Amino acid sequence: MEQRITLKDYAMRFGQTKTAKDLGVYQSAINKAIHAGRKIFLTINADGSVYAEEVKPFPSNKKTTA
Amino acid sequence: MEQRITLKDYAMRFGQTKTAKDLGVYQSAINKAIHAGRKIFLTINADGSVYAEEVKPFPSNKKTTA
């Protein structure tokens, strides 16, 4: 079991204040992350753990299949 | 244990012209990815296929996991 949600879906659907309180970062760090609109996923474990990671295929533009 | 080479080891040990030919990208795209050193790995599927991806933890570098 493990709650997997994007940093923007957990901060927007639950609140950036709680996403920054669980990750420790400040609201300016969670807002800057959403500002980069990059691949920032959030791997929260049932133990109230927050494991945000970054994963984006290169390059940034262009289009390819997985 | 697939072939995992960094975009810098495949473009420097083989050439940025060949690495861009497998990923079908621009030479300035592999040069900017190497200049940003944003954890850009190059996974070459055993089928001679290429799959460059990005992967970095948040925020800077998790010191202790859980």
mmCIF file of N, CA and C in Angstrom:
data_model
loop_
_atom_site.group_PDB
_atom_site.id
_atom_site.type_symbol
_atom_site.label_atom_id
_atom_site.label_comp_id
_atom_site.label_asym_id
_atom_site.label_seq_id
_atom_site.Cartn_x
_atom_site.Cartn_y
_atom_site.Cartn_z
ATOM 1 N N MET A 1 0.861 -1.216 0.000
ATOM 2 C CA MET A 1 0.000 0.000 0.000
ATOM 3 C C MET A 1 0.884 1.248 0.000
ATOM 4 N N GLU A 2 0.439 2.304 -0.626
ATOM 5 C CA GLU A 2 1.256 3.548 -0.662
ATOM 6 C C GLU A 2 0.499 4.632 -1.433
ATOM 7 N N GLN A 3 0.294 5.770 -0.829
ATOM 8 C CA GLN A 3 -0.441 6.862 -1.528
ATOM 9 C C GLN A 3 0.486 7.553 -2.530
ATOM 10 N N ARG A 4 0.243 7.365 -3.798
ATOM 11 C CA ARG A 4 1.106 8.011 -4.826
ATOM 12 C C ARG A 4 0.329 9.149 -5.492
ATOM 13 N N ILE A 5 0.783 10.361 -5.333
ATOM 14 C CA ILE A 5 0.073 11.513 -5.953
ATOM 15 C C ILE A 5 1.097 12.571 -6.368
ATOM 16 N N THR A 6 0.813 13.315 -7.399
ATOM 17 C CA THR A 6 1.774 14.360 -7.855
ATOM 18 C C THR A 6 1.871 15.470 -6.805
ATOM 19 N N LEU A 7 2.977 16.162 -6.766
ATOM 20 C CA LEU A 7 3.144 17.260 -5.772
ATOM 21 C C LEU A 7 2.079 18.334 -6.006
ATOM 22 N N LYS A 8 1.575 18.431 -7.205
ATOM 23 C CA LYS A 8 0.544 19.466 -7.498
ATOM 24 C C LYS A 8 -0.849 18.928 -7.162
ATOM 25 N N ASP A 9 -1.037 17.640 -7.238
ATOM 26 C CA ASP A 9 -2.374 17.064 -6.923
ATOM 27 C C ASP A 9 -2.530 16.933 -5.408
ATOM 28 N N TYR A 10 -1.446 16.791 -4.703
ATOM 29 C CA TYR A 10 -1.532 16.666 -3.223
ATOM 30 C C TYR A 10 -1.528 18.065 -2.613
ATOM 31 N N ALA A 11 -0.824 18.976 -3.223
ATOM 32 C CA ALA A 11 -0.774 20.362 -2.687
ATOM 33 C C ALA A 11 -2.011 21.139 -3.146
ATOM 34 N N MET A 12 -2.561 20.796 -4.282
ATOM 35 C CA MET A 12 -3.763 21.529 -4.776
ATOM 36 C C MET A 12 -5.039 20.848 -4.273
ATOM 37 N N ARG A 13 -5.064 19.546 -4.261
ATOM 38 C CA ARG A 13 -6.290 18.829 -3.800
ATOM 39 C C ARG A 13 -6.334 18.778 -2.270
ATOM 40 N N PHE A 14 -5.204 18.818 -1.618
ATOM 41 C CA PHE A 14 -5.214 18.771 -0.127
ATOM 42 C C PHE A 14 -4.764 20.122 0.432
ATOM 43 N N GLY A 15 -3.877 20.792 -0.249
ATOM 44 C CA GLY A 15 -3.405 22.116 0.245
ATOM 45 C C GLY A 15 -1.877 22.146 0.264
ATOM 46 N N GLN A 16 -1.289 23.176 -0.281
ATOM 47 C CA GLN A 16 0.198 23.268 -0.292
ATOM 48 C C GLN A 16 0.706 23.419 1.143
ATOM 49 N N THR A 17 -0.121 23.914 2.023
ATOM 50 C CA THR A 17 0.311 24.090 3.438
ATOM 51 C C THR A 17 0.571 22.720 4.069
ATOM 52 N N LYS A 18 -0.262 21.757 3.785
ATOM 53 C CA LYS A 18 -0.062 20.403 4.372
ATOM 54 C C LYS A 18 1.069 19.683 3.632
ATOM 55 N N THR A 19 1.209 19.929 2.359
ATOM 56 C CA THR A 19 2.298 19.257 1.591
ATOM 57 C C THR A 19 3.648 19.800 2.061
ATOM 58 N N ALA A 20 3.684 21.035 2.483
ATOM 59 C CA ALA A 20 4.965 21.625 2.964
ATOM 60 C C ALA A 20 5.167 21.247 4.433
ATOM 61 N N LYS A 21 4.103 20.933 5.117
ATOM 62 C CA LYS A 21 4.224 20.549 6.550
ATOM 63 C C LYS A 21 4.651 19.083 6.638
ATOM 64 N N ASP A 22 4.343 18.311 5.632
ATOM 65 C CA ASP A 22 4.737 16.876 5.645
ATOM 66 C C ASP A 22 6.141 16.737 5.055
ATOM 67 N N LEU A 23 6.484 17.581 4.122
ATOM 68 C CA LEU A 23 7.839 17.505 3.508
ATOM 69 C C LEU A 23 8.806 18.387 4.300
ATOM 70 N N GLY A 24 8.291 19.305 5.072
ATOM 71 C CA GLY A 24 9.183 20.193 5.873
ATOM 72 C C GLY A 24 9.507 21.458 5.075
ATOM 73 N N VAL A 25 9.620 21.340 3.780
ATOM 74 C CA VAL A 25 9.937 22.537 2.949
ATOM 75 C C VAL A 25 8.958 23.665 3.279
ATOM 76 N N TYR A 26 9.240 24.860 2.836
ATOM 77 C CA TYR A 26 8.325 26.002 3.131
ATOM 78 C C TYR A 26 7.300 26.142 2.005
ATOM 79 N N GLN A 27 6.332 26.998 2.180
ATOM 80 C CA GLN A 27 5.301 27.187 1.123
ATOM 81 C C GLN A 27 5.954 27.779 -0.128
ATOM 82 N N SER A 28 7.038 28.486 0.036
ATOM 83 C CA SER A 28 7.722 29.086 -1.144
ATOM 84 C C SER A 28 8.475 27.993 -1.907
ATOM 85 N N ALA A 29 8.723 26.878 -1.273
ATOM 86 C CA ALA A 29 9.444 25.774 -1.963
ATOM 87 C C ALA A 29 8.426 24.919 -2.707
ATOM 88 N N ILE A 30 7.276 24.740 -2.127
ATOM 89 C CA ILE A 30 6.222 23.932 -2.790
ATOM 90 C C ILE A 30 5.639 24.742 -3.947
ATOM 91 N N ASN A 31 5.569 26.036 -3.790
ATOM 92 C CA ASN A 31 5.024 26.890 -4.879
ATOM 93 C C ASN A 31 6.048 26.966 -6.011
ATOM 94 N N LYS A 32 7.306 27.079 -5.678
ATOM 95 C CA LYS A 32 8.352 27.147 -6.735
ATOM 96 C C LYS A 32 8.367 25.828 -7.507
ATOM 97 N N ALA A 33 8.161 24.734 -6.826
ATOM 98 C CA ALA A 33 8.152 23.415 -7.517
ATOM 99 C C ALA A 33 6.994 23.385 -8.513
ATOM 100 N N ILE A 34 5.838 23.808 -8.090
ATOM 101 C CA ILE A 34 4.666 23.817 -9.009
ATOM 102 C C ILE A 34 4.916 24.840 -10.115
ATOM 103 N N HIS A 35 5.721 25.832 -9.839
ATOM 104 C CA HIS A 35 6.016 26.866 -10.865
ATOM 105 C C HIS A 35 6.902 26.260 -11.957
ATOM 106 N N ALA A 36 7.757 25.343 -11.598
ATOM 107 C CA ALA A 36 8.641 24.713 -12.618
ATOM 108 C C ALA A 36 7.812 23.755 -13.478
ATOM 109 N N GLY A 37 6.643 23.397 -13.019
ATOM 110 C CA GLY A 37 5.782 22.471 -13.808
ATOM 111 C C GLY A 37 6.617 21.297 -14.322
ATOM 112 N N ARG A 38 7.586 20.866 -13.562
ATOM 113 C CA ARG A 38 8.434 19.726 -14.008
ATOM 114 C C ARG A 38 7.823 18.408 -13.524
ATOM 115 N N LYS A 39 8.479 17.311 -13.788
ATOM 116 C CA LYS A 39 7.941 15.993 -13.344
ATOM 117 C C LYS A 39 8.240 15.790 -11.860
ATOM 118 N N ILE A 40 7.445 16.373 -11.008
ATOM 119 C CA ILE A 40 7.669 16.208 -9.546
ATOM 120 C C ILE A 40 6.552 15.343 -8.967
ATOM 121 N N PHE A 41 6.821 14.086 -8.756
ATOM 122 C CA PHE A 41 5.778 13.180 -8.206
ATOM 123 C C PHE A 41 5.917 13.098 -6.685
ATOM 124 N N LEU A 42 4.896 12.647 -6.008
ATOM 125 C CA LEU A 42 4.970 12.556 -4.522
ATOM 126 C C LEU A 42 4.693 11.122 -4.072
ATOM 127 N N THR A 43 5.675 10.476 -3.511
ATOM 128 C CA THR A 43 5.481 9.080 -3.032
ATOM 129 C C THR A 43 5.277 9.105 -1.517
ATOM 130 N N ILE A 44 4.064 9.292 -1.080
ATOM 131 C CA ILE A 44 3.797 9.343 0.384
ATOM 132 C C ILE A 44 3.509 7.934 0.911
ATOM 133 N N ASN A 45 4.231 7.506 1.911
ATOM 134 C CA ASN A 45 3.995 6.146 2.470
ATOM 135 C C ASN A 45 2.939 6.221 3.576
ATOM 136 N N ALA A 46 2.179 5.169 3.739
ATOM 137 C CA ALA A 46 1.115 5.147 4.788
ATOM 138 C C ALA A 46 1.669 5.625 6.132
ATOM 139 N N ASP A 47 2.962 5.617 6.304
ATOM 140 C CA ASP A 47 3.544 6.078 7.597
ATOM 141 C C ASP A 47 3.661 7.605 7.600
ATOM 142 N N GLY A 48 2.780 8.290 6.918
ATOM 143 C CA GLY A 48 2.853 9.776 6.887
ATOM 144 C C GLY A 48 4.217 10.199 6.347
ATOM 145 N N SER A 49 4.841 9.355 5.572
ATOM 146 C CA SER A 49 6.177 9.711 5.015
ATOM 147 C C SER A 49 6.000 10.399 3.661
ATOM 148 N N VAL A 50 6.843 11.341 3.342
ATOM 149 C CA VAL A 50 6.719 12.031 2.028
ATOM 150 C C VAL A 50 8.004 11.810 1.230
ATOM 151 N N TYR A 51 7.908 11.166 0.101
ATOM 152 C CA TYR A 51 9.125 10.914 -0.720
ATOM 153 C C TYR A 51 8.915 11.499 -2.115
ATOM 154 N N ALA A 52 9.108 12.779 -2.266
ATOM 155 C CA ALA A 52 8.911 13.408 -3.598
ATOM 156 C C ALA A 52 10.122 13.123 -4.481
ATOM 157 N N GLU A 53 9.891 12.806 -5.723
ATOM 158 C CA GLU A 53 11.023 12.506 -6.638
ATOM 159 C C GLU A 53 10.811 13.223 -7.966
ATOM 160 N N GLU A 54 11.827 13.261 -8.768
ATOM 161 C CA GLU A 54 11.718 13.927 -10.093
ATOM 162 C C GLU A 54 11.992 12.888 -11.175
ATOM 163 N N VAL A 55 11.197 12.864 -12.206
ATOM 164 C CA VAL A 55 11.413 11.863 -13.286
ATOM 165 C C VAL A 55 10.879 12.430 -14.599
ATOM 166 N N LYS A 56 11.753 12.798 -15.492
ATOM 167 C CA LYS A 56 11.292 13.369 -16.788
ATOM 168 C C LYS A 56 12.191 12.845 -17.917
ATOM 169 N N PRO A 57 11.577 12.435 -18.999
ATOM 170 C CA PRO A 57 12.301 11.890 -20.162
ATOM 171 C C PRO A 57 12.963 13.007 -20.974
ATOM 172 N N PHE A 58 14.119 12.738 -21.518
ATOM 173 C CA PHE A 58 14.828 13.766 -22.330
ATOM 174 C C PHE A 58 14.527 13.520 -23.810
ATOM 175 N N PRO A 59 14.481 14.586 -24.563
ATOM 176 C CA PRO A 59 14.688 15.953 -24.048
ATOM 177 C C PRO A 59 13.402 16.476 -23.400
ATOM 178 N N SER A 60 13.285 17.767 -23.252
ATOM 179 C CA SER A 60 12.055 18.335 -22.632
ATOM 180 C C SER A 60 10.989 18.522 -23.712
ATOM 181 N N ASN A 61 11.361 19.077 -24.834
ATOM 182 C CA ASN A 61 10.373 19.283 -25.929
ATOM 183 C C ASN A 61 10.320 18.032 -26.807
ATOM 184 N N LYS A 62 9.903 18.175 -28.035
ATOM 185 C CA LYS A 62 9.832 16.994 -28.940
ATOM 186 C C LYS A 62 8.751 16.035 -28.444
ATOM 187 N N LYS A 63 8.600 14.909 -29.089
ATOM 188 C CA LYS A 63 7.560 13.936 -28.655
ATOM 189 C C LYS A 63 8.042 12.512 -28.942
ATOM 190 N N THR A 64 7.923 11.632 -27.986
ATOM 191 C CA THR A 64 8.375 10.229 -28.206
ATOM 192 C C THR A 64 7.422 9.267 -27.491
ATOM 193 N N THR A 65 7.532 7.996 -27.767
ATOM 194 C CA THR A 65 6.636 7.009 -27.101
ATOM 195 C C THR A 65 7.403 6.300 -25.983
ATOM 196 N N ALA A 66 6.706 5.770 -25.015
ATOM 197 C CA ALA A 66 7.395 5.065 -23.898
ATOM 198 C C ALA A 66 7.721 3.632 -24.326
ATOM 199 N N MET B 1 20.156 -6.074 -15.339
ATOM 200 C CA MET B 1 21.382 -5.242 -15.493
ATOM 201 C C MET B 1 21.477 -4.732 -16.931
ATOM 202 N N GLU B 2 20.617 -3.825 -17.307
ATOM 203 C CA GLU B 2 20.662 -3.288 -18.694
ATOM 204 C C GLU B 2 21.851 -2.335 -18.832
ATOM 205 N N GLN B 3 22.103 -1.849 -20.016
ATOM 206 C CA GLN B 3 23.247 -0.915 -20.209
ATOM 207 C C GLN B 3 22.843 0.483 -19.735
ATOM 208 N N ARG B 4 23.391 0.926 -18.636
ATOM 209 C CA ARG B 4 23.034 2.279 -18.121
ATOM 210 C C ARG B 4 24.238 3.213 -18.253
ATOM 211 N N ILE B 5 24.190 4.124 -19.186
ATOM 212 C CA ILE B 5 25.329 5.068 -19.369
ATOM 213 C C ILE B 5 24.814 6.503 -19.261
ATOM 214 N N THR B 6 25.535 7.355 -18.587
ATOM 215 C CA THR B 6 25.080 8.768 -18.448
ATOM 216 C C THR B 6 25.142 9.465 -19.809
ATOM 217 N N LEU B 7 24.285 10.424 -20.032
ATOM 218 C CA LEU B 7 24.287 11.151 -21.333
ATOM 219 C C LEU B 7 25.673 11.747 -21.583
ATOM 220 N N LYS B 8 26.478 11.846 -20.562
ATOM 221 C CA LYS B 8 27.836 12.429 -20.740
ATOM 222 C C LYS B 8 28.840 11.329 -21.094
ATOM 223 N N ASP B 9 28.629 10.135 -20.611
ATOM 224 C CA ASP B 9 29.584 9.030 -20.917
ATOM 225 C C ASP B 9 29.295 8.455 -22.304
ATOM 226 N N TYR B 10 28.069 8.499 -22.737
ATOM 227 C CA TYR B 10 27.741 7.948 -24.081
ATOM 228 C C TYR B 10 28.090 8.984 -25.152
ATOM 229 N N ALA B 11 27.882 10.237 -24.863
ATOM 230 C CA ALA B 11 28.193 11.296 -25.864
ATOM 231 C C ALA B 11 29.697 11.588 -25.873
ATOM 232 N N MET B 12 30.370 11.384 -24.772
ATOM 233 C CA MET B 12 31.835 11.665 -24.738
ATOM 234 C C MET B 12 32.620 10.413 -25.128
ATOM 235 N N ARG B 13 32.154 9.263 -24.730
ATOM 236 C CA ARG B 13 32.882 8.008 -25.067
ATOM 237 C C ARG B 13 32.480 7.526 -26.465
ATOM 238 N N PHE B 14 31.386 8.011 -26.988
ATOM 239 C CA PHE B 14 30.959 7.566 -28.348
ATOM 240 C C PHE B 14 30.819 8.781 -29.268
ATOM 241 N N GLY B 15 30.452 9.910 -28.727
ATOM 242 C CA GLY B 15 30.303 11.126 -29.576
ATOM 243 C C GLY B 15 28.891 11.692 -29.420
ATOM 244 N N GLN B 16 28.756 12.990 -29.439
ATOM 245 C CA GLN B 16 27.404 13.601 -29.292
ATOM 246 C C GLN B 16 26.628 13.448 -30.602
ATOM 247 N N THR B 17 27.315 13.210 -31.686
ATOM 248 C CA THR B 17 26.613 13.053 -32.991
ATOM 249 C C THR B 17 25.912 11.693 -33.035
ATOM 250 N N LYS B 18 26.533 10.677 -32.501
ATOM 251 C CA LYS B 18 25.899 9.328 -32.516
ATOM 252 C C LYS B 18 24.809 9.265 -31.446
ATOM 253 N N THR B 19 25.072 9.798 -30.287
ATOM 254 C CA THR B 19 24.048 9.770 -29.204
ATOM 255 C C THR B 19 22.797 10.519 -29.671
ATOM 256 N N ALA B 20 22.973 11.567 -30.429
ATOM 257 C CA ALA B 20 21.796 12.339 -30.919
ATOM 258 C C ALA B 20 21.127 11.571 -32.059
ATOM 259 N N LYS B 21 21.852 10.698 -32.704
ATOM 260 C CA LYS B 21 21.259 9.917 -33.825
ATOM 261 C C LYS B 21 20.365 8.812 -33.262
ATOM 262 N N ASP B 22 20.698 8.292 -32.112
ATOM 263 C CA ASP B 22 19.864 7.213 -31.514
ATOM 264 C C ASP B 22 18.645 7.833 -30.833
ATOM 265 N N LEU B 23 18.821 8.956 -30.197
ATOM 266 C CA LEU B 23 17.675 9.617 -29.512
ATOM 267 C C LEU B 23 16.988 10.588 -30.476
ATOM 268 N N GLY B 24 17.513 10.733 -31.664
ATOM 269 C CA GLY B 24 16.887 11.660 -32.648
ATOM 270 C C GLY B 24 16.717 13.046 -32.021
ATOM 271 N N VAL B 25 17.736 13.554 -31.385
ATOM 272 C CA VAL B 25 17.623 14.905 -30.762
ATOM 273 C C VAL B 25 18.599 15.863 -31.447
ATOM 274 N N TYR B 26 18.661 17.087 -30.998
ATOM 275 C CA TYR B 26 19.590 18.068 -31.632
ATOM 276 C C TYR B 26 20.926 18.064 -30.886
ATOM 277 N N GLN B 27 21.978 18.492 -31.531
ATOM 278 C CA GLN B 27 23.304 18.520 -30.852
ATOM 279 C C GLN B 27 23.260 19.534 -29.709
ATOM 280 N N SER B 28 22.481 20.572 -29.862
ATOM 281 C CA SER B 28 22.382 21.596 -28.786
ATOM 282 C C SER B 28 21.485 21.067 -27.667
ATOM 283 N N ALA B 29 20.793 19.988 -27.911
ATOM 284 C CA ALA B 29 19.910 19.414 -26.860
ATOM 285 C C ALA B 29 20.756 18.532 -25.951
ATOM 286 N N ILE B 30 21.709 17.851 -26.518
ATOM 287 C CA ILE B 30 22.596 16.983 -25.704
ATOM 288 C C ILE B 30 23.648 17.869 -25.032
ATOM 289 N N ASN B 31 23.952 18.989 -25.632
ATOM 290 C CA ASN B 31 24.961 19.910 -25.037
ATOM 291 C C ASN B 31 24.331 20.653 -23.858
ATOM 292 N N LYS B 32 23.077 20.998 -23.965
ATOM 293 C CA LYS B 32 22.402 21.717 -22.849
ATOM 294 C C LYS B 32 22.114 20.725 -21.723
ATOM 295 N N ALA B 33 21.789 19.510 -22.065
ATOM 296 C CA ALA B 33 21.505 18.491 -21.016
ATOM 297 C C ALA B 33 22.797 18.186 -20.258
ATOM 298 N N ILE B 34 23.902 18.168 -20.949
ATOM 299 C CA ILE B 34 25.202 17.888 -20.275
ATOM 300 C C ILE B 34 25.638 19.135 -19.505
ATOM 301 N N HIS B 35 25.319 20.290 -20.018
ATOM 302 C CA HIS B 35 25.711 21.553 -19.335
ATOM 303 C C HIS B 35 24.888 21.733 -18.057
ATOM 304 N N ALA B 36 23.680 21.243 -18.040
ATOM 305 C CA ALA B 36 22.832 21.395 -16.825
ATOM 306 C C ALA B 36 23.140 20.269 -15.835
ATOM 307 N N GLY B 37 23.775 19.221 -16.290
ATOM 308 C CA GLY B 37 24.106 18.089 -15.374
ATOM 309 C C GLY B 37 22.924 17.815 -14.440
ATOM 310 N N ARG B 38 21.725 17.856 -14.956
ATOM 311 C CA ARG B 38 20.533 17.601 -14.094
ATOM 312 C C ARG B 38 20.244 16.099 -14.040
ATOM 313 N N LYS B 39 21.152 15.333 -13.491
ATOM 314 C CA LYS B 39 20.950 13.858 -13.393
ATOM 315 C C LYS B 39 20.250 13.342 -14.644
ATOM 316 N N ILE B 40 20.959 13.319 -15.732
ATOM 317 C CA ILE B 40 20.374 12.817 -17.003
ATOM 318 C C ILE B 40 21.026 11.478 -17.337
ATOM 319 N N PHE B 41 20.305 10.406 -17.174
ATOM 320 C CA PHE B 41 20.890 9.071 -17.458
ATOM 321 C C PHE B 41 20.508 8.623 -18.871
ATOM 322 N N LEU B 42 21.205 7.652 -19.393
ATOM 323 C CA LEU B 42 20.904 7.161 -20.769
ATOM 324 C C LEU B 42 20.716 5.642 -20.731
ATOM 325 N N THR B 43 19.494 5.186 -20.713
ATOM 326 C CA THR B 43 19.246 3.716 -20.666
ATOM 327 C C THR B 43 19.151 3.157 -22.087
ATOM 328 N N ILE B 44 20.079 2.324 -22.471
ATOM 329 C CA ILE B 44 20.038 1.740 -23.843
ATOM 330 C C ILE B 44 19.449 0.328 -23.776
ATOM 331 N N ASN B 45 18.196 0.179 -24.107
ATOM 332 C CA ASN B 45 17.563 -1.168 -24.058
ATOM 333 C C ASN B 45 18.425 -2.174 -24.826
ATOM 334 N N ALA B 46 18.594 -3.347 -24.274
ATOM 335 C CA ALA B 46 19.421 -4.398 -24.939
ATOM 336 C C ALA B 46 19.075 -4.502 -26.426
ATOM 337 N N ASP B 47 17.919 -4.044 -26.825
ATOM 338 C CA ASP B 47 17.547 -4.129 -28.266
ATOM 339 C C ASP B 47 18.145 -2.939 -29.027
ATOM 340 N N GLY B 48 19.284 -2.456 -28.608
ATOM 341 C CA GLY B 48 19.906 -1.300 -29.309
ATOM 342 C C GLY B 48 18.975 -0.093 -29.218
ATOM 343 N N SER B 49 18.028 -0.132 -28.322
ATOM 344 C CA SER B 49 17.086 1.015 -28.186
ATOM 345 C C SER B 49 17.636 2.001 -27.154
ATOM 346 N N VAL B 50 17.301 3.256 -27.280
ATOM 347 C CA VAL B 50 17.808 4.257 -26.301
ATOM 348 C C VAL B 50 16.651 4.787 -25.456
ATOM 349 N N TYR B 51 16.940 5.223 -24.263
ATOM 350 C CA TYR B 51 15.871 5.764 -23.380
ATOM 351 C C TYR B 51 16.505 6.685 -22.340
ATOM 352 N N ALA B 52 16.773 7.908 -22.707
ATOM 353 C CA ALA B 52 17.395 8.855 -21.743
ATOM 354 C C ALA B 52 16.313 9.391 -20.807
ATOM 355 N N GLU B 53 16.584 9.435 -19.533
ATOM 356 C CA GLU B 53 15.561 9.934 -18.574
ATOM 357 C C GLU B 53 16.214 10.841 -17.539
ATOM 358 N N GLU B 54 15.408 11.465 -16.740
ATOM 359 C CA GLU B 54 15.931 12.365 -15.679
ATOM 360 C C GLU B 54 15.444 11.826 -14.342
ATOM 361 N N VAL B 55 16.243 11.901 -13.317
ATOM 362 C CA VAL B 55 15.791 11.356 -12.012
ATOM 363 C C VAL B 55 16.554 12.034 -10.876
ATOM 364 N N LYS B 56 15.881 12.859 -10.123
ATOM 365 C CA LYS B 56 16.549 13.562 -8.994
ATOM 366 C C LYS B 56 15.565 13.636 -7.818
ATOM 367 N N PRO B 57 16.074 13.434 -6.629
ATOM 368 C CA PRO B 57 15.255 13.443 -5.401
ATOM 369 C C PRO B 57 14.852 14.864 -4.997
ATOM 370 N N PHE B 58 13.993 14.973 -4.018
ATOM 371 C CA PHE B 58 13.534 16.312 -3.553
ATOM 372 C C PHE B 58 13.696 16.399 -2.031
ATOM 373 N N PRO B 59 14.106 17.549 -1.561
ATOM 374 C CA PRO B 59 14.418 18.714 -2.411
ATOM 375 C C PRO B 59 15.814 18.568 -3.023
ATOM 376 N N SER B 60 16.838 18.689 -2.223
ATOM 377 C CA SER B 60 18.220 18.556 -2.757
ATOM 378 C C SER B 60 18.592 17.072 -2.836
ATOM 379 N N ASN B 61 18.981 16.489 -1.736
ATOM 380 C CA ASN B 61 19.354 15.049 -1.747
ATOM 381 C C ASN B 61 18.941 14.405 -0.422
ATOM 382 N N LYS B 62 17.974 13.530 -0.454
ATOM 383 C CA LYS B 62 17.523 12.868 0.801
ATOM 384 C C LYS B 62 18.730 12.282 1.534
ATOM 385 N N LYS B 63 18.972 12.711 2.741
ATOM 386 C CA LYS B 63 20.134 12.174 3.502
ATOM 387 C C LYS B 63 19.763 10.816 4.104
ATOM 388 N N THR B 64 18.607 10.718 4.704
ATOM 389 C CA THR B 64 18.190 9.420 5.305
ATOM 390 C C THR B 64 16.785 9.062 4.817
ATOM 391 N N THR B 65 16.639 7.932 4.176
ATOM 392 C CA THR B 65 15.295 7.529 3.674
ATOM 393 C C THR B 65 14.488 6.908 4.816
ATOM 394 N N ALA B 66 13.306 7.404 5.056
ATOM 395 C CA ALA B 66 12.470 6.842 6.154
ATOM 396 C C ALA B 66 13.317 6.692 7.420
#
